[PDB]
Design a protein around this ligand. Structure first.
Ligand SMILES: [Mg+2]
Ligand SMILES: [Mg+2]
Ligand SMILES: [Mg+2]
Ligand SMILES: [Mg+2]
Ligand SMILES: [Mg+2]
Ligand SMILES: [Mg+2]
Ligand SMILES: [Mg+2]
Ligand SMILES: [Mg+2]
Ligand SMILES: [Mg+2]
Ligand SMILES: [Mg+2]
Ligand SMILES: [Mg+2]
Ligand SMILES: [Mg+2]
Ligand SMILES: [Mg+2]
Ligand SMILES: [Mg+2]
Ligand SMILES: [Mg+2]
Ligand SMILES: [Mg+2]
Ligand SMILES: [Mg+2]
Ligand SMILES: [Mg+2]
Ligand SMILES: [Mg+2]
Ligand SMILES: [Mg+2]
Ligand SMILES: [Mg+2]
Ligand SMILES: [Mg+2]
Ligand SMILES: [Mg+2]
Ligand SMILES: [Mg+2]
Ligand SMILES: [Mg+2]
Ligand SMILES: [Mg+2]
Ligand SMILES: [Mg+2]
Ligand SMILES: [Mg+2]
Ligand SMILES: [Mg+2]
Ligand SMILES: [Mg+2]
Ligand SMILES: [Mg+2]
Ligand SMILES: [Mg+2]
Ligand SMILES: [Mg+2]
Ligand SMILES: [Mg+2]
Ligand SMILES: [Mg+2]
Ligand SMILES: [Mg+2]
Ligand SMILES: [Mg+2]
Ligand SMILES: [Mg+2]
Ligand SMILES: [Mg+2]
Ligand SMILES: [Mg+2]
Ligand SMILES: [Mg+2]
Ligand SMILES: [Mg+2]
Ligand SMILES: [Mg+2]
Ligand SMILES: [Mg+2]
Ligand SMILES: [Mg+2]
Ligand SMILES: [Mg+2]
Ligand SMILES: [Mg+2]
Ligand SMILES: [Mg+2]
Ligand SMILES: [Mg+2]
Ligand SMILES: [Mg+2]
Ligand SMILES: [Mg+2]
Ligand SMILES: [Mg+2]
Ligand SMILES: [Mg+2]
Ligand SMILES: [Mg+2]
Ligand SMILES: [Mg+2]
Ligand SMILES: [Mg+2]
Ligand SMILES: [Mg+2]
Ligand SMILES: [Mg+2]
Ligand SMILES: [Mg+2]
Ligand SMILES: [Mg+2]
Ligand SMILES: [Mg+2]
Ligand SMILES: [Mg+2]
Ligand SMILES: [Mg+2]
Ligand SMILES: [Mg+2]
Ligand SMILES: [Mg+2]
Ligand SMILES: [Mg+2]
Ligand SMILES: [Mg+2]
Ligand SMILES: [Mg+2]
Ligand SMILES: [Mg+2]
Ligand SMILES: [Mg+2]
Ligand SMILES: [Mg+2]
Ligand SMILES: [Mg+2]
Ligand SMILES: [Mg+2]
Ligand SMILES: [Mg+2]
Ligand SMILES: [Mg+2]
Ligand SMILES: [Mg+2]
Ligand SMILES: [Mg+2]
Ligand SMILES: [Mg+2]
Ligand SMILES: [Mg+2]
Ligand SMILES: [Mg+2]
Ligand SMILES: [Mg+2]
Ligand SMILES: [Mg+2]
Ligand SMILES: [Mg+2]
Ligand SMILES: [Mg+2]
Ligand SMILES: [Mg+2]
Ligand SMILES: [Mg+2]
Ligand SMILES: [Mg+2]
Ligand SMILES: [Mg+2]
Ligand SMILES: [Mg+2]
Ligand SMILES: [Mg+2]
Ligand SMILES: [Mg+2]
Ligand SMILES: [Mg+2]
Ligand SMILES: [Mg+2]
Ligand SMILES: [Mg+2]
Ligand SMILES: [Mg+2]
Ligand SMILES: [Mg+2]
Ligand SMILES: [Mg+2]
Ligand SMILES: [Mg+2]
Ligand SMILES: [Mg+2]
Ligand SMILES: [Mg+2]
Ligand SMILES: [Mg+2]
Ligand SMILES: [Mg+2]
Ligand SMILES: [Mg+2]
Ligand SMILES: [Mg+2]
Ligand SMILES: [Mg+2]
Ligand SMILES: [Mg+2]
Ligand SMILES: [Mg+2]
Ligand SMILES: [Mg+2]
Ligand SMILES: [Mg+2]
Ligand SMILES: [Mg+2]
Ligand SMILES: [Mg+2]
Ligand SMILES: [Mg+2]
Ligand SMILES: [Mg+2]
Ligand SMILES: [Mg+2]
Ligand SMILES: [Mg+2]
Ligand SMILES: [Mg+2]
Ligand SMILES: [Mg+2]
Ligand SMILES: [Mg+2]
Ligand SMILES: [Mg+2]
Ligand SMILES: [Mg+2]
Ligand SMILES: [Mg+2]
Ligand SMILES: [Mg+2]
Ligand SMILES: [Mg+2]
Ligand SMILES: [Mg+2]
Ligand SMILES: [Mg+2]
Ligand SMILES: [Mg+2]
Ligand SMILES: [Mg+2]
Ligand SMILES: [Mg+2]
Ligand SMILES: [Mg+2]
Ligand SMILES: [Mg+2]
Ligand SMILES: [Mg+2]
Ligand SMILES: [Mg+2]
Ligand SMILES: [Mg+2]
Ligand SMILES: [Mg+2]
Ligand SMILES: [Mg+2]
Ligand SMILES: [Mg+2]
Ligand SMILES: [Mg+2]
Ligand SMILES: [Mg+2]
Ligand SMILES: [Mg+2]
Ligand SMILES: [Mg+2]
Ligand SMILES: [Mg+2]
Ligand SMILES: [Mg+2]
Ligand SMILES: [Mg+2]
Ligand SMILES: [Mg+2]
Ligand SMILES: [Mg+2]
Ligand SMILES: [Mg+2]
Ligand SMILES: [Mg+2]
Ligand SMILES: [Mg+2]
Ligand SMILES: [Mg+2]
Ligand SMILES: [Mg+2]
Ligand SMILES: [Mg+2]
Ligand SMILES: [Mg+2]
Ligand SMILES: [Mg+2]
Ligand SMILES: [Mg+2]
Ligand SMILES: [Mg+2]
Ligand SMILES: [Mg+2]
Ligand SMILES: [Mg+2]
Ligand SMILES: [Mg+2]
Ligand SMILES: [Mg+2]
Ligand SMILES: [Mg+2]
Ligand SMILES: [Mg+2]
Ligand SMILES: [Mg+2]
Ligand SMILES: [Mg+2]
Ligand SMILES: [Mg+2]
Ligand SMILES: [Mg+2]
Ligand SMILES: [Mg+2]
Ligand SMILES: [Mg+2]
Ligand SMILES: [Mg+2]
Ligand SMILES: [Mg+2]
Ligand SMILES: [Mg+2]
Ligand SMILES: [Mg+2]
Ligand SMILES: [Mg+2]
Ligand SMILES: [Mg+2]
Ligand SMILES: [Mg+2]
Ligand SMILES: [Mg+2]
Ligand SMILES: [Mg+2]
Ligand SMILES: [Mg+2]
Ligand SMILES: [Mg+2]
Ligand SMILES: [Mg+2]
Ligand SMILES: [Mg+2]
Ligand SMILES: [Mg+2]
Ligand SMILES: [Mg+2]
Ligand SMILES: [Mg+2]
Ligand SMILES: [Mg+2]
Ligand SMILES: [Mg+2]
Ligand SMILES: [Mg+2]
Ligand SMILES: [Mg+2]
Ligand SMILES: [Mg+2]
Ligand SMILES: [Mg+2]
Ligand SMILES: [Mg+2]
Ligand SMILES: [Mg+2]
Ligand SMILES: [Mg+2]
Ligand SMILES: [Mg+2]
Ligand SMILES: [Mg+2]
Ligand SMILES: [Mg+2]
Ligand SMILES: [Mg+2]
Ligand SMILES: [Mg+2]
Ligand SMILES: [Mg+2]
Ligand SMILES: [Mg+2]
Ligand SMILES: [Mg+2]
Ligand SMILES: [Mg+2]
Ligand SMILES: [Mg+2]
Ligand SMILES: [Mg+2]
Ligand SMILES: [Mg+2]
Ligand SMILES: [Mg+2]
Ligand SMILES: [Mg+2]
Ligand SMILES: [Mg+2]
Ligand SMILES: [Mg+2]
Ligand SMILES: [Mg+2]
Ligand SMILES: [Mg+2]
Ligand SMILES: [Mg+2]
Ligand SMILES: [Mg+2]
Ligand SMILES: [Mg+2]
Ligand SMILES: [Mg+2]
Ligand SMILES: [Mg+2]
Ligand SMILES: [Mg+2]
Ligand SMILES: [Mg+2]
Ligand SMILES: [Mg+2]
Ligand SMILES: [Mg+2]
Ligand SMILES: [Mg+2]
Ligand SMILES: [Mg+2]
Ligand SMILES: [Mg+2]
Ligand SMILES: [Mg+2]
Ligand SMILES: [Mg+2]
Ligand SMILES: [Mg+2]
Ligand SMILES: [Mg+2]
Ligand SMILES: [Mg+2]
Ligand SMILES: [Mg+2]
Ligand SMILES: [Mg+2]
Ligand SMILES: [Mg+2]
Ligand SMILES: [Mg+2]
Ligand SMILES: [Mg+2]
Ligand SMILES: [Mg+2]
Ligand SMILES: [Mg+2]
Ligand SMILES: [Mg+2]
Ligand SMILES: [Mg+2]
Ligand SMILES: [Mg+2]
Ligand SMILES: [Mg+2]
Ligand SMILES: [Mg+2]
Ligand SMILES: [Mg+2]
Ligand SMILES: [Mg+2]
Ligand SMILES: [Mg+2]
Ligand SMILES: [Mg+2]
Ligand SMILES: [Mg+2]
Ligand SMILES: [Mg+2]
Ligand SMILES: [Mg+2]
Lengths: 97, 146
RNA sequence: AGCCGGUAGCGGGCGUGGAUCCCUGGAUGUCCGAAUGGGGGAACCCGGCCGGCGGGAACGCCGGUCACCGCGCGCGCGGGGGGAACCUGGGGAACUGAAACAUCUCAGUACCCAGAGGAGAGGAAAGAGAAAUCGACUCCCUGAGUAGCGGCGAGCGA
RNA sequence: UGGUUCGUGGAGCCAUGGGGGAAUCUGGGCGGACCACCGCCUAAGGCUAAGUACUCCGGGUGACCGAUAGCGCACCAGUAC
RNA sequence: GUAGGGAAACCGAGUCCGAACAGGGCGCAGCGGCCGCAAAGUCCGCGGCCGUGGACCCGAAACCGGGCGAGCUAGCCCUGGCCAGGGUGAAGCUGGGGUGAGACCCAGUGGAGGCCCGAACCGGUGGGGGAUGCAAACCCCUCGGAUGAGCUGGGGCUAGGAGUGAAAAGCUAACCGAGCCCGGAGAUAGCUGGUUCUCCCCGAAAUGACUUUAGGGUCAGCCUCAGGCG
RNA sequence: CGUAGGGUUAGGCGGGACCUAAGGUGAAGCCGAAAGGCGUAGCCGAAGGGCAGCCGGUUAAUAUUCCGGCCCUUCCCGCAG
RNA sequence: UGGUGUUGGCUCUUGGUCGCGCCUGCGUAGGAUAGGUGGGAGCCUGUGAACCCCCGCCUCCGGGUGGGGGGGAGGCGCCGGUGAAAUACCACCCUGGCGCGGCUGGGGGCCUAACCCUCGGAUGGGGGGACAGCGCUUGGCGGGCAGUUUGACUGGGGCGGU
RNA sequence: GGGCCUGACUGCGAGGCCUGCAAGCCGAGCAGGGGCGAAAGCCGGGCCUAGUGAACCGGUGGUCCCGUGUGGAAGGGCCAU
RNA sequence: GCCCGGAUAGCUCAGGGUAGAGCAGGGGAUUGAAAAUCCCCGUGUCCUUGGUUCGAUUCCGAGUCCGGGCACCA
């Protein structure tokens, strides 16, 4: 899952820490680390289809910024849009950011 | 997710009212079918801009009717006809009552807005009903004479 | 006042009417190469359009123009590739040390990638931290192997 | 999860992949869990010389080498092979 | 450096443990006639040794990163080529026989097959030779397959914990139980080897305790030098 | 082998200005931290398809190439049907 | 594999806490169906009584009760008899039931519009369908793979012994 | 064998044994508050030599020593186990 | 160390107003018996100690023993 086109959220590198033992605060000797290795945390990317000036535009977006898509659809009502292709439309909708 | 209904909808609300729905129902159903719009702030005052006009435009329709109920309830359109003892040879229609008003008092009147189902064939004093705007009706005193 | 590079000789020339030679600007600059008309096993092969040359229409040569991508109202402008180290960002080992070994160490180092520029990063407090105080950021000394962190081991370290 | 001296520790701070999701100064963040009090500072927009680094390049200088040394190459060397 | 004691608050030539004025721990105090010399300490130089660094020099078998190889070899893909000559004689067909019709029988024809013999071609069984070779796998005699799961040219694809494998851990450019090159890198080596002028004095140990320790270490023992005591 | 001089002649032979095969590449499109990985048509890709020359003579050295004899292909323009 | 996001519409029937309703509560003595306690000689009835019918009903099968169609001057308490606890009316509540309202969670039936597949026709038709896929998080199986560990003494080492 | 009892003490400890270290062992006497004995005196477990495990990490009772601007708190320290 | 359990007759298991039931054991009926079957019969501090109530299997508390489960191990 690549990149949110609205927020620019992208996959980040994380660790995955494996622990044994009873935490000190529960009365145990404490926690011991039995493995640390690398992994990727991904943005929850989804498709959002909307029709703008009679053209289907598809966004790859983190579920965080889903309502931001419709916001740009509003702000495009003052724009002169008809005649352009679904590519040029998406460009305009994004420069409003 | 509050949105603005643009159509009365089954167990949601009346057009112009703002109600709450789950997001999926909104952005995947109500919105692409024109059935509503999201209740942003931009098209929120836009809604207050319409309830404002309609309030004042409907009150002007009530205020102009009064600027004629005052007149018409303070006068007598007198219609001289040709008649024998009681019954007229011709008749006086709303059209006649209309043009006769424009003749004497010069008030312009819509004859189709006058409560006359049968043309008038008998001398006397009549008080009829004039409804320019409903719930604001006028009682016109009109004297027909030979 | 000599000169036609190393480089002498053969055979021929130039210079006080200022050469050779040294500096700056300019002109020329085959083909390949980011390579960019298109193709291709780099330095080869094959085209469109405009103008020219030959007896020239076929054929060939000469000059000009023609890639992709981005950005602004078909026209412009910009991008590409390279550069000894140095710099920022995105990824990121292991031997080794712990006299075995896994947490820890080596080290965010080696290396890969993107980008930058003569530097780059950073930078004008939602800061510091106890001074009733200071007053952007960067770099050097000191603070200090301190405070602390640590299978409280080996070590790490403001 | 990462960063910091901080390896889960009483673990704050800065950064953020997921979920929930505010207010405009009588708003908000910080002073190492947390609460009070007392103070510090104004987040989610951008730019900014100089002092810093390096040495393909040019010059100056060595209690630097002197042809098995000094650069791999003093010489037609990143060559012959 | 000039004050230490205590985990600390803290006190201070003291302090901590303690109820203590108890007891104990760790601490506290120049030579000569105000002048001079010496000295705590500290600064710089020199020397021995220790810590961190590759740390006396040379040497692994290996681990890891980024690249380079399928012109050798293995499999597959696309497109071409090659297999003298001879021998055997399946099915089917035709005719004859047979029967109620058949099954089936004989003859002829026919030309099948991981069929047979044997060159080219592809192999490499036994023996001998070669063994600083003609050759880092060859030569001679002999022997297997030779229409097939056949052999072979040109164009291609698949690679390093990965390929490919009628399976041998085979092969992946003349050593593959994990290729090659450059890099981390002077990896690490408690092991083995090596360690360069002269003279003078002294002079060991191969034991004990503990040790994932036993051919390695830490302390003690034994050697040496300096200052002091006598 | 050393030094010098000379020698390779094509519309028809082979390849190109022709076609496609595996495969490679790749406007559309799809995917991946970056580098990049895919991908229909299209383009490239040959010892496969396609396409018009045979015999003799000559040089120290080239010959279906030069020469001789006899044949043929495509492109342009013109005339005729 | 649970929670959650992407993720929506309509129903059916549930359950768990919270507020209120109305009661269910029958060992033995006894009038009879005695929750626990306390208050209290008056609660009632035209602001519908002593009897007939539907039943919500729960019945311990003896009885409890409501709202309806019955109904046009009547009830039961103090008194008590035996009680550990007197009965009426009123209330604070326990063990329990459900009528209603709150958040809720659970399953089940359907739908289409997200998302997925398909359709020479693609702002559309068809099928799957809020499942699947994909994101963050939970626990588990996991030599397919990775990093490693697998002691010493020893009349050689192993085995044995220590 | 019996009576009374809890010294199977608290705060310390001259001086020694043993010994590479670290440990192990024996100890008179002073103070607090006690048991027994008329008293002298004895008693800091057991005739004696085996019946044991350094540190790290954490639990529990106490102490009120530290408490990250300040008052608390979180968390440590100390004594005991 | 923490939560959930149990104990009831000889073995097993059921349980605010009872002390239960089955199997083992006793005789009696029954056959050639080995039986099944039929019968009647016993076997309790319900672990113990406080408390609850008018009362105690229950309910509470607290200890004893034995079951389960959880986490831990310097
Ligand atoms: Mg994790
Ligand atoms: Mg605690
Ligand atoms: Mg841990
Ligand atoms: Mg830890
Ligand atoms: Mg990993
Ligand atoms: Mg998507
Ligand atoms: Mg969507
Ligand atoms: Mg749509
Ligand atoms: Mg979010
Ligand atoms: Mg959200
Ligand atoms: Mg913004
Ligand atoms: Mg008329
Ligand atoms: Mg000359
Ligand atoms: Mg000359
Ligand atoms: Mg002159
Ligand atoms: Mg001049
Ligand atoms: Mg020039
Ligand atoms: Mg080009
Ligand atoms: Mg090209
Ligand atoms: Mg031209
Ligand atoms: Mg000419
Ligand atoms: Mg021309
Ligand atoms: Mg040309
Ligand atoms: Mg051109
Ligand atoms: Mg590039
Ligand atoms: Mg550049
Ligand atoms: Mg860097
Ligand atoms: Mg970085
Ligand atoms: Mg790696
Ligand atoms: Mg590591
Ligand atoms: Mg390691
Ligand atoms: Mg290792
Ligand atoms: Mg090291
Ligand atoms: Mg090691
Ligand atoms: Mg080691
Ligand atoms: Mg090892
Ligand atoms: Mg290691
Ligand atoms: Mg590590
Ligand atoms: Mg290192
Ligand atoms: Mg590190
Ligand atoms: Mg980096
Ligand atoms: Mg480097
Ligand atoms: Mg500068
Ligand atoms: Mg700068
Ligand atoms: Mg500012
Ligand atoms: Mg300020
Ligand atoms: Mg600062
Ligand atoms: Mg100030
Ligand atoms: Mg300033
Ligand atoms: Mg510093
Ligand atoms: Mg200091
Ligand atoms: Mg640390
Ligand atoms: Mg460390
Ligand atoms: Mg660290
Ligand atoms: Mg570090
Ligand atoms: Mg820092
Ligand atoms: Mg850190
Ligand atoms: Mg952290
Ligand atoms: Mg960390
Ligand atoms: Mg922290
Ligand atoms: Mg924050
Ligand atoms: Mg967040
Ligand atoms: Mg405001
Ligand atoms: Mg404020
Ligand atoms: Mg506020
Ligand atoms: Mg903040
Ligand atoms: Mg602060
Ligand atoms: Mg805070
Ligand atoms: Mg604070
Ligand atoms: Mg501040
Ligand atoms: Mg600011
Ligand atoms: Mg900031
Ligand atoms: Mg800048
Ligand atoms: Mg300036
Ligand atoms: Mg600067
Ligand atoms: Mg330098
Ligand atoms: Mg220089
Ligand atoms: Mg120089
Ligand atoms: Mg010299
Ligand atoms: Mg030399
Ligand atoms: Mg040299
Ligand atoms: Mg020499
Ligand atoms: Mg030398
Ligand atoms: Mg050089
Ligand atoms: Mg050399
Ligand atoms: Mg050089
Ligand atoms: Mg040399
Ligand atoms: Mg050379
Ligand atoms: Mg101290
Ligand atoms: Mg004290
Ligand atoms: Mg004292
Ligand atoms: Mg003392
Ligand atoms: Mg001195
Ligand atoms: Mg020495
Ligand atoms: Mg030393
Ligand atoms: Mg080294
Ligand atoms: Mg080093
Ligand atoms: Mg070394
Ligand atoms: Mg050294
Ligand atoms: Mg390794
Ligand atoms: Mg390994
Ligand atoms: Mg590699
Ligand atoms: Mg390669
Ligand atoms: Mg091959
Ligand atoms: Mg090959
Ligand atoms: Mg073929
Ligand atoms: Mg053959
Ligand atoms: Mg044949
Ligand atoms: Mg044959
Ligand atoms: Mg044959
Ligand atoms: Mg024969
Ligand atoms: Mg024969
Ligand atoms: Mg035959
Ligand atoms: Mg035939
Ligand atoms: Mg036959
Ligand atoms: Mg024949
Ligand atoms: Mg045959
Ligand atoms: Mg055969
Ligand atoms: Mg044969
Ligand atoms: Mg054969
Ligand atoms: Mg055979
Ligand atoms: Mg061969
Ligand atoms: Mg052989
Ligand atoms: Mg062979
Ligand atoms: Mg033989
Ligand atoms: Mg042999
Ligand atoms: Mg050999
Ligand atoms: Mg041979
Ligand atoms: Mg032979
Ligand atoms: Mg032979
Ligand atoms: Mg043979
Ligand atoms: Mg044979
Ligand atoms: Mg043969
Ligand atoms: Mg054969
Ligand atoms: Mg044959
Ligand atoms: Mg074949
Ligand atoms: Mg082949
Ligand atoms: Mg082939
Ligand atoms: Mg071949
Ligand atoms: Mg090939
Ligand atoms: Mg393959
Ligand atoms: Mg491959
Ligand atoms: Mg490998
Ligand atoms: Mg590798
Ligand atoms: Mg494999
Ligand atoms: Mg094979
Ligand atoms: Mg090789
Ligand atoms: Mg090789
Ligand atoms: Mg090989
Ligand atoms: Mg091998
Ligand atoms: Mg290996
Ligand atoms: Mg390996
Ligand atoms: Mg190897
Ligand atoms: Mg090889
Ligand atoms: Mg090689
Ligand atoms: Mg390299
Ligand atoms: Mg390097
Ligand atoms: Mg290293
Ligand atoms: Mg080395
Ligand atoms: Mg090693
Ligand atoms: Mg060794
Ligand atoms: Mg030696
Ligand atoms: Mg001496
Ligand atoms: Mg001697
Ligand atoms: Mg000895
Ligand atoms: Mg010894
Ligand atoms: Mg040991
Ligand atoms: Mg050993
Ligand atoms: Mg041994
Ligand atoms: Mg050993
Ligand atoms: Mg050794
Ligand atoms: Mg020693
Ligand atoms: Mg001695
Ligand atoms: Mg001696
Ligand atoms: Mg000595
Ligand atoms: Mg001496
Ligand atoms: Mg002496
Ligand atoms: Mg020659
Ligand atoms: Mg020639
Ligand atoms: Mg010709
Ligand atoms: Mg052409
Ligand atoms: Mg083509
Ligand atoms: Mg594209
Ligand atoms: Mg990736
Ligand atoms: Mg590409
Ligand atoms: Mg590609
Ligand atoms: Mg393709
Ligand atoms: Mg073409
Ligand atoms: Mg082509
Ligand atoms: Mg190609
Ligand atoms: Mg081609
Ligand atoms: Mg061809
Ligand atoms: Mg063909
Ligand atoms: Mg051909
Ligand atoms: Mg041809
Ligand atoms: Mg011909
Ligand atoms: Mg000639
Ligand atoms: Mg020839
Ligand atoms: Mg010829
Ligand atoms: Mg000719
Ligand atoms: Mg014509
Ligand atoms: Mg999951
Ligand atoms: Mg869901
Ligand atoms: Mg359905
Ligand atoms: Mg649909
Ligand atoms: Mg569709
Ligand atoms: Mg559809
Ligand atoms: Mg559909
Ligand atoms: Mg459907
Ligand atoms: Mg459904
Ligand atoms: Mg789902
Ligand atoms: Mg979760
Ligand atoms: Mg997991
Ligand atoms: Mg396993
Ligand atoms: Mg393994
Ligand atoms: Mg598996
Ligand atoms: Mg393996
Ligand atoms: Mg071990
Ligand atoms: Mg051994
Ligand atoms: Mg031995
Ligand atoms: Mg032995
Ligand atoms: Mg022995
Ligand atoms: Mg022996
Ligand atoms: Mg022996
Ligand atoms: Mg053994
Ligand atoms: Mg006694
Ligand atoms: Mg007494
Ligand atoms: Mg002593
Ligand atoms: Mg000792
Ligand atoms: Mg002992
Ligand atoms: Mg005493
Ligand atoms: Mg006494
Ligand atoms: Mg006494
Ligand atoms: Mg006494
Ligand atoms: Mg004593
Ligand atoms: Mg210990
Ligand atoms: Mg430790
Ligand atoms: Mg501790
Ligand atoms: Mg405590
Ligand atoms: Mg305090
Ligand atoms: Mg504080
Ligand atoms: Mg306070
Ligand atoms: Mg305080
Ligand atoms: Mg504490
Ligand atoms: Mg504590
Ligand atoms: Mg505390």
């Amino acid at each position: 899952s690549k990149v949110c086109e609205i927020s620019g959220k992208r996959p980040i590198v994380a660790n995955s820490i494996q622990r044994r033992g009873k935490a000190k605060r529960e009365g145990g000797v404490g926690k011991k680390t039995t493995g640390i290795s690398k992994r990727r945390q991904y943005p929850n990317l989804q498709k959002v289809r909307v029709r703008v000036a009679g053209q289907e535009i598809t966004f790859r977006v983190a579920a965080s910024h889903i309502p931001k898509v419709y916001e740009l659809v509003e702000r495009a009502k003052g724009l002169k849009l008809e005649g352009l292709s679904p590519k040029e439309i998406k460009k305009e909708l994004l420069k409003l950011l | 997710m509050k949105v603005i209904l643009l159509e009365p909808l089954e167990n949601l609300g009346d057009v112009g009212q703002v109600v709450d729905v789950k997001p999926g129902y909104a952005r995947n159903y109500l919105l692409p079918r024109g059935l509503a719009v999201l209740a942003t702030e931009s098209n929120l005052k836009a809604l207050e801009a319409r309830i404002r006009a309609q309030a004042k435009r409907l009150a002007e329709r009530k205020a102009e009717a009064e600027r004629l109920k005052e007149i018409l309830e303070n006068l007598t359109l007198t219609i001289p006809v040709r008649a024998g003892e009681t019954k007229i040879y011709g008749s006086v229609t709303a059209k006649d009552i209309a043009e006769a008003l424009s003749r004497q008092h010069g008030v312009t009147i819509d004859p189709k807005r006058l409560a006359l189902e049968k043309p008038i064939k008998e001398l006397g004093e009549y008080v009829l009903t004039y409804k320019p705007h409903p719930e604001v009706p006028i009682q016109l005193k009109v004297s027909v004479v030979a």
